[PDB]
């Protein structure tokens, strides 16, 4: 079927620029309008631009006028997007979405998305520190353990316990900025029967930084 | 630009019961409104088209309408799964639009939150830093409110909250709060001390170590 995969999401200096990717198949590609449009982390979705199925007809966004440049490469079925300039505000998960559903235009297939950050923080990935109930918690049946994710950059951050052993009773936190650098944390309940004879772990990954942190959780 | 509002931004509601949700333009729409749904993982996908149609795999539970410049998205019954970002669009006319969105979520029963307060580890503190974390879990409805008290003393500086998304299983909700501290000033207070306030209770939910 229809298939829409984009690519050449990632960090960069405002000012700055990049250029996105996104590999169509299963259909006729030459035949197709596309679009750019992109969703901020807070938030919504926000049209970028269009491109007619021979690159003849290009509409832009009022926000990206003259800095965002749409094209194509028809014989490699891949759509773009050429981004200069890039402001802050341009930070947001960027999808292309087919102009298909004739007659009745609609955008109704749409790639995964890919992540762009516009800021001159740098890639650091986090500490990572285990949390580690009381000074050890006696009671309850039920015991709740956590895992500190901190002064990363930029997101995301993917938050496993034993590996993927543990998923239910798991929190983990959307991420908030503090001092130009990213934070979470993630809980965990486990059997206080079981812990901590049976060993429990948060794993911390940071794709940016192809960095990969485990830390058991220890009682005190 | 065809401006579109659409409102509620977040909006509950009870597993059997209708959900209404509302776009207005700014200016007249000639049953170009679409509709998309978005799941938490996932892209917006394709929904309604033409006002009133349901597109490929759409449930009947689904349904637009409108005309010039009021439409609307109904879900009757709302069902477990129906738990989405909701966005209507215009293509009418260049440039093309979306309204600012809706959160559906579930209403359930009212939950107190379960707290749980950690100390900085010994491993954050050997590097200067001392984060203080509370965990309010598993708690409805989302509104809550948290303040941090060190020996006593409100102290909003250095407060980081975050909400996660309504849970899949419980239809519940648990925030993440942090005090941001250094050791330095860490060591020379005596008692941490998140407090919360919730409509599940008259008194505020309180919960307190001595650092040791």
């Known amino acids: 079927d229809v298939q829409l995969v984009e690519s050449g999401g990632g960090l960069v200096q405002p000012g700055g620029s990049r250029k996105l990717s996104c590999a169509a198949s299963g259909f006729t590609f030459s035949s197709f309008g596309m679009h750019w449009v992109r969703q901020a982390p807070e938030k919504g979705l926000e049209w970028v631009a269009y491109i007619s199925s021979g690159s003849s007809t290009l509409h832009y966004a009022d926000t990206v006028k003259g800095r965002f440049t749409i094209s194509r490469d028809n014989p490699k079925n891949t759509l773009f997007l050429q981004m200069t300039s890039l402001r802050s505000e341009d930070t947001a998960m960027y999808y292309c979405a087919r102009w298909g559903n004739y007659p009745h235009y609609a955008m109704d297939y749409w790639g995964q998305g890919t992540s762009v950050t516009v800021s001159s923080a740098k890639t650091t990935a986090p500490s990572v520190y285990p949390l580690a109930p009381v000074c050890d918690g006696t009671t309850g049946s039920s015991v709740t353990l956590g895992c500190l994710v901190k002064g990363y950059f930029p997101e995301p951050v993917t938050l496993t316990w034993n590996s993927g052993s543990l998923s239910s009773g798991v929190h983990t936190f959307p991420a908030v900025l503090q001092s130009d650098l990213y934070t979470l944390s993630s809980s965990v309940t486990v059997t206080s029967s079981t812990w901590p004879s049976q060993s429990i772990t948060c794993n911390v990954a940071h794709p940016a930084s192809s960095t990969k942190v485990d830390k058991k959780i220890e009682p005190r | 630009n065809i401006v579109m509002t659409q409102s509620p931004k977040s909006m509950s509601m009870s597993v059997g019961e209708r959900v209404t949700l509302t776009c207005k333009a700014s200016?007249?729409?000639?049953?170009?409104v679409s509709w998309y749904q978005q799941k938490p993982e996932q892209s917006p996908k394709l929904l309604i088209y033409?006002?009133?149609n349901r597109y490929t795999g759409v449930p009947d539970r689904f349904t637009g309408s409108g005309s010039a410049t009021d439409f609307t998205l109904t879900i009757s019954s709302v069902q477990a799964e129906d738990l989405a970002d909701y966005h209507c669009?215009?293509?009418?006319?260049?440039?093309?639009?979306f309204g600012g969105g809706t959160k559906l979520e579930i209403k359930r029963a009212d939950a107190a939150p379960t707290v749980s307060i950690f100390p900085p580890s010994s491993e954050q503190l050997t590097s200067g830093g001392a984060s203080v974390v509370c965990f309010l879990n598993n708690f409805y409805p989302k509104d809550i409110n948290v303040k941090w008290k060190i020996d006593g003393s409100e102290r909003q500086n250095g407060v980081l909250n975050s909400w996660t998304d309504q849970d899949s299983k419980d239809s519940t909700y648990s925030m993440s709060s942090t005090l941001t501290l250094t050791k330095d000033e860490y060591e020379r207070h005596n008692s941490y001390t998140c407090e919360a306030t919730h409509k599940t209770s008259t008194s505020p939910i309180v919960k307190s170590f001595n650092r040791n």
């Open positions: 669009g215009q293509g009418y006319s260049y440039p093309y639009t």
């Open positions: 200016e007249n729409v000639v049953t170009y």
């Open positions: 033409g006002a009133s």
